[PDB]
Write a protein that binds this ligand. Structure first.
Ligand SMILES: [K+]
Ligand SMILES: [K+]
Ligand SMILES: [K+]
Length: 180
DNA sequence: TGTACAATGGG
């Protein structure tokens, strides 16, 4: 019952689970956001992932869970200001893609937050294997993030199905690495 | 590349 860990569990416990309908709606928004981000990259000559990360950094203020173990830190503030500057200065026709991209990353963050409880339930099955509980959570969280990136809502499978696959993969890979 | 029943206290 690590104080910081107990506090994380308390915090993710307040995030309600998504209904099927909401799940589909968020996943749809993430897809649309990635397509818009592609367009912004073509227009600006900037890396898609760099655009995504900056757009994310600008929607985190409205987020429910701020510090999530295992998640990539925001880029340095100067990179943010610079890239956010270029995106904001784009012509009318392109600024709608920016709106769609912002909606997508806001949706991604929500979808991730609403599944942190699943990561924890799986992690509990892997304790005493060389990684601390907190470490299991960090690795599981990175599997969750990968799940979100590759999830295809059109297959009509529940998100928990695909996330479980990835969270186990990530945790198993981390355990095998620790072991050498 | 692709990785997919559901699973979020546990069984
Ligand atoms: K019961
Ligand atoms: K009970
Ligand atoms: K029961």
């Amino acid at each position: 019952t690590s104080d910081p860990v107990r506090q994380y569990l308390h915090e993710i416990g307040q995030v309600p689970l998504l209904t099927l309908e909401e799940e589909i709606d968020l996943a749809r928004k993430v897809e649309e956001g990635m397509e818009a981000i592609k367009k912004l990259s073509e227009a600006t000559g900037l890396d898609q992932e760099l655009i995504r990360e900056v757009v994310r950094a600008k929607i985190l203020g409205t987020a429910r869970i701020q510090k999530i173990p295992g998640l990539k830190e925001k880029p340095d503030p100067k990179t943010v200001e610079e890239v956010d500057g270029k995106l904001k200065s784009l012509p009318k026709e392109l600024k709608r893609y920016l709106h769609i991209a912002r909606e997508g990353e806001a949706a991604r963050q929500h979808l991730i937050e609403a599944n942190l409880r699943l990561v924890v339930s799986i992690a509990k099955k892997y304790t005493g294997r060389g990684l601390s509980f907190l470490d299991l959570i960090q690795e599981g969280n990175q599997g969750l993030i990968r799940a979100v990136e590759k999830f295809e809502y059109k297959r009509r499978f529940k998100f928990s199905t695909y996330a479980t696959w990835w969270i186990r993969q990530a945790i198993n890979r981390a355990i095998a690495d620790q072991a050498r």
